[PDB]
Amino acid sequence: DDWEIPDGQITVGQRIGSGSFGTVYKGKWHGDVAVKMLNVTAPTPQQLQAFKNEVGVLRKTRHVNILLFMGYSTKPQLAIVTQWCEGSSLYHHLHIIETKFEMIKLIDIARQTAQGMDYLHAKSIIHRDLKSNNIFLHEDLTVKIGDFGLATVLSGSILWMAPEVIRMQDKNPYSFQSDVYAFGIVLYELMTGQLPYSNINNRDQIIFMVGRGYLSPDLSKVRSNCPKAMKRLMAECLKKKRDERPLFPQILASIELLARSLPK
Ligand SMILES: OCCCc1n[nH]c2cccc(Nc3c(-c4ncccn4)oc4cnccc34)c12
Residue 167: CATH number of its domain: 1.10.510.10
22 belongs to an annotated ligand binding site: yes
- Centre of ligand 1 to C-alpha 24, Å, is 6
The HSE-up count of residue 32 (CA atoms within 13 Å, CB side) is: 6
Q: Establish whether residue 118 lines the binding site of ligand 1, counting it when its CB lies within 6 angstroms of any ligand atom.
A: no
Sign of CA dihedral 151, 132, 117, 38: negative
Same domain membership, residue 68 and residue 139: no
d(CA 264, CA 259): 10
Same domain membership, residue 177 and residue 58: no
Same domain membership, residue 200 and residue 126: yes
Same domain membership, residue 68 and residue 197: no
What is the number of structural domains in the chain?
Answer: 2
Residue 215: what residue type? L
User: Of 86, 107, 141, which residue is a domain's last?
Assistant: 86
**Experimental approach taken:** X-ray
> How far is the CA of 119 from the CAs of 56, 63, 64, 179, 191, in angstroms?
16, 8, 10, 13, 23
User: Of 86, 102, 135, which residue is a domain's last?
Assistant: 86
Same domain membership, residue 246 and residue 122: yes
Among residues 231, 242, 166, the alpha carbon closest in space to that of 204 is found at 166
Q: To test the ligand 1 pocket, which listed residue (28, 147, 157) has its Cβ within 8 A of the most ligand atoms?
A: 147
- Centre of ligand 1 to C-alpha 213, Å, is 33
- Alpha carbon 62 to its chain's center: 16
User: Of 86, 106, 126, which residue is a domain's last?
Assistant: 86
Cβ atoms of 161 and 225 closer than 8 Å? no
Per-residue burial over 56-66, b if 16 or more Cβ lie within 10 Å, else e, is: ebbebbebebb
Q: Establish whether residue 34 lines the binding site of ligand 1, counting it when its CB lies within 6 angstroms of any ligand atom.
A: yes
DSSP 8-state secondary structure symbol assigned to residue 134: G
36 belongs to an annotated ligand binding site: yes
Cβ atoms of 143 and 116 closer than 8 Å? yes
Domain that holds residue 134: 87-264
Residue 73: CATH number of its domain: 3.30.200.20
Q: To test the ligand 1 pocket, which listed residue (21, 23, 67, 157) has its Cβ within 8 A of the most ligand atoms?
A: 67
Catalytic residue flag (residue 129): yes
Cα–Cα–Cα angle for 224, 230, 231, nearest 5°? 60
Same domain membership, residue 57 and residue 78: yes
Q: Which of 108, 129, 147, 179 is catalytic?
A: 129
- The residue whose CA is least distant from atom 6 of ligand 1 is 147
Rg from Cα positions in the chain: 19
> At what resolution in Å was this solved?
3.5
> Looking at the DSSP assignment, which residues form a beta bridge with residue 35?
25, 81
